[PDB]
Coordinates of N, CA and C in Angstrom, one line a residue:
Chain A
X97 N -5.2 15.9 -44.3 CA -6.2 15.4 -43.4 C -6.0 13.9 -43.1
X98 N -5.3 13.2 -44.0 CA -4.9 11.8 -43.7 C -3.9 11.8 -42.6
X99 N -2.9 12.7 -42.7 CA -1.8 12.6 -41.7 C -2.3 13.3 -40.4
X100 N -3.3 14.1 -40.4 CA -3.8 14.7 -39.2 C -4.5 13.5 -38.4
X101 N -5.1 12.6 -39.1 CA -5.6 11.4 -38.4 C -4.5 10.6 -37.8
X102 N -3.4 10.5 -38.5 CA -2.2 9.7 -38.0 C -1.5 10.5 -36.9
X103 N -1.4 11.8 -37.0 CA -0.8 12.6 -36.0 C -1.6 12.7 -34.7
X104 N -3.0 12.6 -34.9 CA -3.8 12.6 -33.7 C -3.8 11.2 -33.1
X105 N -3.8 10.1 -33.9 CA -3.9 8.8 -33.3 C -2.6 8.4 -32.6
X106 N -1.5 9.0 -33.0 CA -0.2 8.6 -32.3 C -0.1 9.1 -30.9
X107 N -0.6 10.4 -30.7 CA -0.6 10.9 -29.3 C -1.8 10.3 -28.6
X108 N -2.8 9.8 -29.3 CA -3.8 9.0 -28.6 C -3.2 7.7 -28.1
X109 N -2.3 7.1 -28.9 CA -1.6 5.9 -28.5 C -0.7 6.1 -27.3
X110 N 0.0 7.3 -27.3 CA 0.8 7.7 -26.2 C -0.1 7.8 -24.9
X111 N -1.3 8.4 -25.1 CA -2.3 8.3 -24.0 C -2.7 6.9 -23.7
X112 N -2.8 6.0 -24.7 CA -3.3 4.7 -24.5 C -2.3 3.8 -23.7
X113 N -1.0 3.8 -24.1 CA -0.1 3.0 -23.3 C 0.2 3.6 -21.9
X114 N 0.0 4.9 -21.8 CA 0.2 5.6 -20.5 C -0.9 5.3 -19.6
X115 N -2.2 5.4 -20.1 CA -3.3 5.1 -19.2 C -3.4 3.6 -18.9
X116 N -3.0 2.8 -19.8 CA -3.1 1.3 -19.5 C -2.1 1.0 -18.4
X117 N -0.9 1.7 -18.3 CA 0.1 1.5 -17.3 C -0.4 2.0 -16.0
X118 N -0.9 3.3 -16.0 CA -1.2 3.9 -14.7 C -2.5 3.4 -14.1
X119 N -3.4 3.0 -14.9 CA -4.6 2.3 -14.4 C -4.2 1.0 -13.7
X120 N -3.3 0.3 -14.3 CA -2.7 -0.9 -13.6 C -1.9 -0.4 -12.4
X121 N -1.2 0.8 -12.5 CA -0.5 1.4 -11.4 C -1.5 2.0 -10.4
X122 N -2.8 2.2 -10.9 CA -3.8 2.4 -9.9 C -4.2 1.1 -9.3
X123 N -4.3 0.0 -10.2 CA -5.0 -1.2 -9.7 C -4.1 -2.0 -8.7
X124 N -2.8 -2.1 -9.0 CA -1.9 -2.9 -8.1 C -1.9 -2.4 -6.7
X125 N -2.1 -1.1 -6.5 CA -2.3 -0.6 -5.1 C -3.7 -0.5 -4.8
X126 N -4.6 -0.7 -5.8 CA -6.1 -0.6 -5.4 C -6.6 -1.8 -4.7
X127 N -6.3 -3.0 -5.2 CA -6.7 -4.2 -4.5 C -5.7 -4.5 -3.3
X128 N -4.5 -3.8 -3.3 CA -3.5 -4.0 -2.2 C -4.1 -3.6 -0.9
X129 N -4.9 -2.5 -0.9 CA -5.5 -2.0 0.3 C -6.7 -2.8 0.7
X130 N -7.2 -3.7 -0.2 CA -8.3 -4.5 0.3 C -7.8 -5.5 1.3
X131 N -6.7 -6.2 1.0 CA -6.2 -7.2 1.9 C -5.6 -6.6 3.2
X132 N -5.3 -5.3 3.2 CA -5.0 -4.6 4.4 C -6.1 -4.7 5.4
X133 N -7.4 -4.4 4.9 CA -8.6 -4.5 5.6 C -8.6 -3.5 6.8
Chain B
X99 N 0.3 1.8 45.2 CA -0.1 0.6 44.5 C -1.3 0.9 43.6
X100 N -2.2 1.8 44.0 CA -3.3 2.2 43.2 C -2.9 3.0 42.0
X101 N -1.8 3.8 42.2 CA -1.2 4.5 41.1 C -0.5 3.4 40.1
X102 N 0.1 2.4 40.7 CA 0.7 1.3 40.0 C -0.4 0.3 39.5
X103 N -1.7 0.5 39.6 CA -2.7 -0.3 39.0 C -2.9 -0.1 37.5
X104 N -2.9 1.2 37.1 CA -3.1 1.5 35.7 C -1.9 0.9 34.8
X105 N -0.7 0.7 35.3 CA 0.1 -0.4 34.7 C -0.2 -1.8 35.3
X106 N -0.7 -2.7 34.5 CA -1.0 -4.0 35.1 C -2.0 -4.8 34.3
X107 N -3.0 -5.4 35.0 CA -4.0 -6.2 34.4 C -5.1 -5.5 33.7
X108 N -4.9 -4.2 33.3 CA -6.0 -3.6 32.6 C -6.2 -4.3 31.3
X109 N -5.0 -4.6 30.6 CA -5.0 -5.5 29.5 C -4.1 -6.6 30.0
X110 N -4.5 -7.8 30.1 CA -3.7 -8.9 30.6 C -2.3 -9.0 30.1
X111 N -1.3 -9.3 31.0 CA 0.1 -9.4 30.6 C 0.3 -10.5 29.6
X112 N -0.4 -11.6 29.7 CA -0.3 -12.6 28.6 C -0.9 -12.0 27.3
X113 N -2.0 -11.3 27.4 CA -2.6 -10.6 26.3 C -1.7 -9.5 25.8
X114 N -0.9 -8.9 26.7 CA 0.1 -8.0 26.3 C 1.2 -8.7 25.5
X115 N 1.6 -9.9 25.9 CA 2.6 -10.7 25.2 C 2.1 -11.0 23.8
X116 N 0.8 -11.3 23.6 CA 0.2 -11.6 22.3 C 0.2 -10.3 21.5
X117 N -0.3 -9.2 22.1 CA -0.4 -8.0 21.3 C 0.9 -7.2 21.0
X118 N 2.0 -7.6 21.7 CA 3.3 -7.1 21.3 C 3.6 -7.6 19.9
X119 N 3.3 -8.9 19.6 CA 3.5 -9.4 18.2 C 2.5 -8.7 17.3
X120 N 1.3 -8.4 17.7 CA 0.4 -7.6 16.9 C 1.0 -6.3 16.5
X121 N 1.5 -5.5 17.4 CA 2.1 -4.2 17.1 C 3.4 -4.4 16.3
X122 N 4.2 -5.4 16.5 CA 5.3 -5.7 15.7 C 4.9 -6.0 14.2
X123 N 3.9 -6.8 14.1 CA 3.4 -7.2 12.8 C 2.7 -6.0 12.1
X124 N 2.1 -5.1 12.9 CA 1.6 -3.8 12.3 C 2.7 -3.0 11.8
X125 N 3.8 -2.8 12.5 CA 4.9 -2.0 12.1 C 5.5 -2.7 10.8
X126 N 5.6 -4.0 10.8 CA 6.2 -4.7 9.7 C 5.4 -4.7 8.4
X127 N 4.0 -4.8 8.6 CA 3.2 -4.7 7.4 C 3.0 -3.3 6.9
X128 N 3.1 -2.3 7.8 CA 3.2 -0.9 7.3 C 4.4 -0.7 6.5
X129 N 5.6 -1.2 7.0 CA 6.8 -1.0 6.3 C 6.7 -1.8 5.0
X130 N 6.1 -3.0 5.0 CA 6.0 -3.9 3.8 C 5.2 -3.2 2.7
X131 N 4.1 -2.6 3.0 CA 3.3 -1.8 2.0 C 4.1 -0.6 1.6
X132 N 4.9 0.0 2.5 CA 5.7 1.1 2.0 C 6.8 0.8 1.0
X133 N 7.6 -0.3 1.2 CA 8.5 -0.7 0.1 C 7.8 -1.4 -1.0
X134 N 6.6 -1.9 -0.9 CA 5.9 -2.4 -2.1 C 5.4 -1.2 -2.9
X135 N 5.0 -0.1 -2.3 CA 4.6 1.1 -3.1 C 5.9 1.7 -3.7
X136 N 7.0 1.8 -3.0 CA 8.2 2.4 -3.5 C 9.0 1.6 -4.5
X137 N 8.9 0.3 -4.3 CA 9.9 -0.6 -5.1 C 9.5 -0.8 -6.5
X138 N 8.2 -0.9 -6.8 CA 7.8 -1.3 -8.2 C 8.0 -0.1 -9.1
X139 N 8.5 -0.4 -10.3 CA 8.8 0.6 -11.4 C 7.5 0.7 -12.2
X140 N 6.6 1.5 -11.8 CA 5.3 1.7 -12.6 C 5.5 2.4 -13.9
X141 N 6.6 3.1 -14.1 CA 7.0 3.6 -15.4 C 7.6 2.6 -16.3
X142 N 7.4 2.7 -17.6 CA 7.9 1.8 -18.6 C 9.3 2.1 -18.9

């Protein structure tokens, strides 16, 4: 049950670094279409 | 000549000269956003 917390949190971190990248990959084109107007 | 009116001063020729650059800038900024979307490596 200790390692299940570690095995769960590691794929959580894989979600964490992936979501932080693609939300920025959302963001960089998100404000990009603002200045297109 | 009336047939040749719908090419002419409907949009002024000087204004045509200005909006030629507007269309060229539209094409260029469309291309610019296209290679800005394609160029960045969003993957780590």
